[PDB]
Symmetry: D2
Amino acid sequence: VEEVRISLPHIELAAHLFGPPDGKPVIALHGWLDNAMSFSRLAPKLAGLRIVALDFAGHGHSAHRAEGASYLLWDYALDVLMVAEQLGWERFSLLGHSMGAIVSVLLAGALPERIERLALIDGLIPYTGEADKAPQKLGEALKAQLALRHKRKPVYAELEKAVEARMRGEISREAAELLAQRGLEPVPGGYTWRTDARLTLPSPLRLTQAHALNFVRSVECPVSLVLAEQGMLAVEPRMRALLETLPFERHHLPGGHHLHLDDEAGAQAVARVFAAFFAR
Amino acid sequence: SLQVEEVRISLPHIELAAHLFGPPDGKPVIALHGWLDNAMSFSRLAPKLAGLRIVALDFAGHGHSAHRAEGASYLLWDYALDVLMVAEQLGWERFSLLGHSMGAIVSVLLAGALPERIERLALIDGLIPYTGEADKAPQKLGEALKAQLALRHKRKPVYAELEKAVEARMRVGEISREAAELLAQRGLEPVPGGYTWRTDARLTLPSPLRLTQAHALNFVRSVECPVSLVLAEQGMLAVEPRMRALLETLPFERHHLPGGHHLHLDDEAGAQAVARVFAAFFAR
Amino acid sequence: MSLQVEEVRISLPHIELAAHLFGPPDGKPVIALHGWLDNAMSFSRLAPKLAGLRIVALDFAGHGHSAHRAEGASYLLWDYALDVLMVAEQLGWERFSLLGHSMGAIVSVLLAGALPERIERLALIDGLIPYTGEADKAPQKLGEALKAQLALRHKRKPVYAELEKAVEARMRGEISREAAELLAQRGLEPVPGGYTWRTDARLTLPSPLRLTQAHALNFVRSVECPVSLVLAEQGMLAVEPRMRALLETLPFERHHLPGGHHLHLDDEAGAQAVARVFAAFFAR
Amino acid sequence: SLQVEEVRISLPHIELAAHLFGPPDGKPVIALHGWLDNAMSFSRLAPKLAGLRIVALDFAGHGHSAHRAEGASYLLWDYALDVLMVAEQLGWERFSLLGHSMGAIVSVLLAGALPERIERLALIDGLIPYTGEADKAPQKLGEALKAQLALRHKRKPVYAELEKAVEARMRGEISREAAELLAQRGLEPVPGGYTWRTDARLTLPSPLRLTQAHALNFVRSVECPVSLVLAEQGMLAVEPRMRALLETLPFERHHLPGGHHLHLDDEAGAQAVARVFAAFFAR
C-alpha cells in the first residue's frame, strides 16, 4: 500500500508512501505547483525513513479546497499537522523543497514540540512585505479575487507539449515528466496541469521581515539546508548574510532549484547529506 | 405597494442574508455589525437615516447568513472581501460603510485597501483591531494551530426557554434587554433542547497572524474619505488615552454620546443621538 | 412584553433551511409545505388564521431563503420528504402534522404513506399525486434526464430591472397580483441588473425516474391519518378531470371551494374559506 | 517517454480518480467496478485487452474518487450520469462500457437510455438490479428514510493490522489476492490503523427501486452488441428467471467457472474473461 487518501475533516489529501512502516516518521512537502513526485528520485535513497510524500491541497491528486478557502502558508501548515494526527504521529520530521521548506520552517517555529528535524531543499523564508505597503497589497488581493472566476487553465492537445510547457516555467525533461505523471489531468482537448485558480492569487497579508526572522529563530530542532549553487542563493545573496546568523547546517551543491529531481546525480548528492543528517 | 426587505445575496463562494432599509434611490450604504451580532444591530438606527439605501448585511457565520464552507477562515479581511463582493452583486460602484465594533474595523480595512471604492465611513465604537507584534507571531500561530486541532471538542449552549436565551445575551449594563431581544430574533435557531445562538464554532479560533501595530496604523492612515466616528461614553475606546492620541493625529470627525457599546441599539434616544451625527454627515 | 421569534434557520446535517414561525409555542405542531418555485409566504394569509397551531412554514431547499443543495444533489420529491422529516427531528418533534399546497401536498402524502407513525394529520390544498410515468417510457425519460443534466451549465435566470416587472412575470407562471407580491417578498434576490426570482437551475431538470401510476396510488392508499383536501374550482380538477373519480375512492375529507390553484393566497376570502375548513379539521 | 497512468477527472459536481490502461489510440472503453470495490478490480483483466484504451474509473465514494457532497445520493443513475460526464471530459462521443456487477448494471442503464453513445457492452456477472414493486414502495421509502436518520450513529471499523483489514474484505466468496489488490486502492490510514475508505451513505437502501417492468424495459432497450460473461454457478447464471430472461435476449452469453469476481481472483480467471472480450472487441 504505497498510495493513499488521507481524510482530514475539511479536505481529503493524496499521498505516496515511501520506505518501511517502522522507519523514522517523515512528511515530505513539495514546492509551488509541483506535487509529491518531486521526491521521486530522493525518497527511495533515504532508507530507514518512512516518508509520506504529501500532495498539498490543490496540487497533484489532493483535493481542491472548498469554496471561499485560502491557500496561505499557514493553511498548509495546518493541513500537514492534521495529516500527522490522522496517521497517529506524535513527533515527526519534515523533508521540504522550496515552498514546502518554508511551510516546514513555520511549523517547526510554531510547534517546536512536534518537529524532530528539518531537511530543507533550497527554501527557507517567504517573500516578505512591510506594514507601509500592506493596505496596498490587501487591495490588490481583493481585486484579484473579483477576477478569480475568469482565470484560465491552459490545455495541451499532446503530452510532450505539456512536459515542455513545464520546463519554460527551469528543470530537466525527466523532472518535468516525473511531475507530469502525477500532475496532469485529461480535459476534452488533451491534458491540463491540474491546479486551483486561487493558487495564483496575491496574498492579502505577507509576513514582515521581522515575522520571518522570528520564525527562523524559533526553530529548536536541527536543520539541514541544501542550497543549489545555481538556485536560491543565485537569486538572493542577501540570504547569505541571514544564513550566517543562523545555526542551520548548510551544504552548497551543484545544480538548479530542483537539483534533487533534475538528475540521479543531484538526488544522490542530496540523499547523502540527508542520510547522514537523519542518522545522528 | 411592494417592498423587498429581506433577501439573500449570492456571492460565488457563500450566500449571505441582508435586510434592506430606505428608498431604492438613496445613497448606497452597507451596514456591518459586530462580532457574534447580526443585522438587527441596526434595527433602530437604519430607519432613522432616511436618505440612505442601507444594506444591513449578516456577516458569514452570523444571523441568517450561511456558514463558510469547510476549512474556510473567519479573518477580518475575509469579511472585507465578502463586503466588496456584496457591492459587486448589487451593481454598486462607489458606496459608503456604516459599521459597529468589528464592522467598523472591517470598514476601515476596506477603505484603506480600496480608497477608490469607499465614499464615506460612519463608525460606531470601533476603529482598529487588537494587534500582535512579530516577536510573538510564532507562539500565536502555534496557539492557533493547536486550537484548530481541539476545535472538535467545543459545544453550543441550548436554552429551553427563550427568556433564558435573551438573558444569556446580556451577561450589568453592557447591553439592554430590548437590545438583546432585537438581536435574539435574528440570532436564534431552534434545536431539540429549544434555542441556540446561531454561530460557527470557528469564530472562536485565534487568528493565525494578527496585524502588527504598524499594520493597523497604516490602514487607518490610508483612509482617504470622510470618516465620522462615534464613541460610547461608557465604552472602552472613549477611555483609552492611546485612542485619544491616535485620533488627534487623524482627520476623522469624532463625537461622544451617552450609553454603552450598543448605544445605537439599546434605546430610541441612543439611536437618535447617533442618527443626528450620521444624518448630517451623509447629507454633505 | 417579550419579542418572540418569527424567522429562523433550521440546521439539518446536509443543508440549512429557512422557516417562518406562526402561532403559540405550545400549539399543535404543524409543518407547512409550499409549491414548486413558491416559498413560505404561500401561507402568509392562512397561517395567522389557524389559531390553534404551531406552524413551521418551511422554505424547501432551493426556494425562498433556504440554502440551495450542495453540488450534485437532486431535487426529487423524496429528497424533500427527508428534509421535512429531518426538520421535525431538529425541532425535537416526535409526531406532527402537515399542511401542504400543490407540490408540498404531494410531498406530504409521500411522507405520510412512508412513515405513518409520525404524521398525525394531513391538511392538503389542491394537490395529491405527482405526474407519473410508466416503465415503457423509462429508458427514454432517463435519457432525457442525462441530456438535460449535460446541458444544465447553460441555464440562466431572468433579470428584471423593475420590481414590478418581476411581479408581473409571476402572474403568468394564474395567480392574483397580491399573491405574486406576497411571494416576491420572499422570492427575489438582488443581482447586478436588479432582481431575479431566486431558484436553483436544477429545479428545471426532468426526473431521471418517475413514479409509476401504481406507485402514486399506493402512496395514497398507505396514508393512515385523517386527511382534509381542499379543491379549487379552477384548480386541479379543472385541469385533470380524471381526478374527480380517484378522489371518490379515498377516505379523504373533501371541500370544494372557489378560486384558482392558489385560492389560499390569492385573496383574503380564499384564505378565510380555507382556514375555517382546516381549523375545524385540526380541532378534531 | 513516461506515460500518464493515474489521473483525476474533473466533473462539474465531483472529482473522480481513474487508472488509464492501454494505447492512447485504442478503442475507447470506460471500465466500471462493483459495489464497494475500486478500479483495481480490473488490475488483471485490462492489461490483457490490448487493443483498448481502458479508463478504469473509481465510482464516487469508492477507491480514490471523492465522496459526494453533503446530501447527495448514491443511486444507480447518479453513477450513470457520472460515467457520461467522464466521457464528456475525455472528449469521447461514442464509447464502450466494460462493467463488473453494479458497474454492469450501470452500463445497461446507460446503453438503454442513450443508445446513440454506447458502442458495445462487455459485462461481467451483472445485468439488472434487484427490483421491487409499487405495492411495497411506501414501506421501502420509509425504511430508506429511517436508515437516513440513523446513519449518523454508525462508525466505520478500524483495523490495527493491515492484514486484519484485508481479511475483513473476504466476508460473497473472493480470493486473498483479489482482496489485497482491492485493498491497495481502497484502504486509508487512520489514527488506530486502517479503514476501508467508503461513504457510509453507500449502505443506505434505495428510496425507490426499479420495478421488474423497468428492469426488463432497460435490458430490452440495449441496441448495441453485448458480451455477457456469467459465473457458472452464480445466481445470475442458474436462477430459472435469469436463464429464461436471458434466452430471450440477443446478448452473447458465456458461462465460465469461477466466482462473482472471476476476472480478479486469479490470472487464470482473468485470462479466460480476456479471451471472450478480446474476440468481442475485434469484430
